[PDB]
Amino acid sequence: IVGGYTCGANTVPYQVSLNSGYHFCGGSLINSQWVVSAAHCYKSGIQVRLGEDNINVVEGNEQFISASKSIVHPSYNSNTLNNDIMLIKLKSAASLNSRVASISLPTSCASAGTQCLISGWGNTKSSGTSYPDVLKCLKAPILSDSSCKSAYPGQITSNMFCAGYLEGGKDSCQGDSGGPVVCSGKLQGIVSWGSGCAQKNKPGVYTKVCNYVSWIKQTIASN
Numbered sequence: 493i494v495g496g497y498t499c500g501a502n503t504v505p506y507q508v509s510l511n512s513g514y515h516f517c518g519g520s521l522i523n524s525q526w527v528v529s530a531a532h533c534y535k536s537g538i539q540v541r542l543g544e545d546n547i548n549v550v551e552g553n554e555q556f557i558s559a560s561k562s563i564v565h566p567s568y569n570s571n572t573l574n575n576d577i578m579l580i581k582l583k584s585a586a587s588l589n590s591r592v593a594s595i596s597l598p599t600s601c602a603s604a605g606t607q608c609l610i611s612g613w614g615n616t617k618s619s620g621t622s623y624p625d626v627l628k629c630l631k632a633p634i635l636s637d638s639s640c641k642s643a644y645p646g647q648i649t650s651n652m653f654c655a656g657y658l659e660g661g662k663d664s665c666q667g668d669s670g671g672p673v674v675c676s677g678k679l680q681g682i683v684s685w686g687s688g689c690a691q692k693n694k695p696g697v698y699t700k701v702c703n704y705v706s707w708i709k710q711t712i713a714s715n
């Protein structure tokens with residue numbers, strides 16, 4: 493996250509880290525046994541880490557649970573990043589409390605102008621590299637589809653939205669990928685891609701979770 497603030501320990505209780513020997517992507521806890529992330533984060537041998545603040549120090553609220561199964565969206569296109577979403581099932585159910593909680597899936601799509609919280613452990617610099625140990629947060633509005641498609645001509649589909657600031661300075665970034673965009677208490681997006689980070693006229697682009705609800709519910713009911 494560039495231009496954000498330190499969320500504070502376990503203030504974002506649905507935030508996950510995906511670990512394969514190291515943090516590589518975020519994710520969101522959607523019930524005791526299921527995580528939603530970005531299909532571009534797919535790897536074999538994932539360990540899910542819940543209850544994290546400092547990802548380098550054991551501070552007492554963690555639960556580290558390996559993944560049983562990963563399901564990448566049937567239509568995911570790695571060249572376009574269209575349908576950039578995947579489901580991870582945990583080998584055992586997480587123990588849910590105040591500091592480790594699921595986030596609700598949406599009933600409606602959220603509109604342009606809605607304010608959202610985006611969080612992750614990703615790069616905090618627009619130029620150069622500097623990875624935080626503690627969780628960082630950003631509040632950012634959803635942009636109009638017009639503005640989004642004018643920023644990324646030919647690249648935005650129905651399954652994406654923009655969020656952030658056209659003036660740059662404030663964005664998500666590499667390492668935040670797969671993580672949550674929560675608006676009005678519901679999971680609306682997943683951190684997917686962008687041109688650089690926090691650059692002027694190049695906002696972040698997010699998977700539009702309200703288009704996948706039926707696919708998520710069906711999947712989890714049968715697996």
Ligand SMILES: [Ca+2]
Nearest residue numbers: 546549550551
């Ligand atoms: Ca920790």
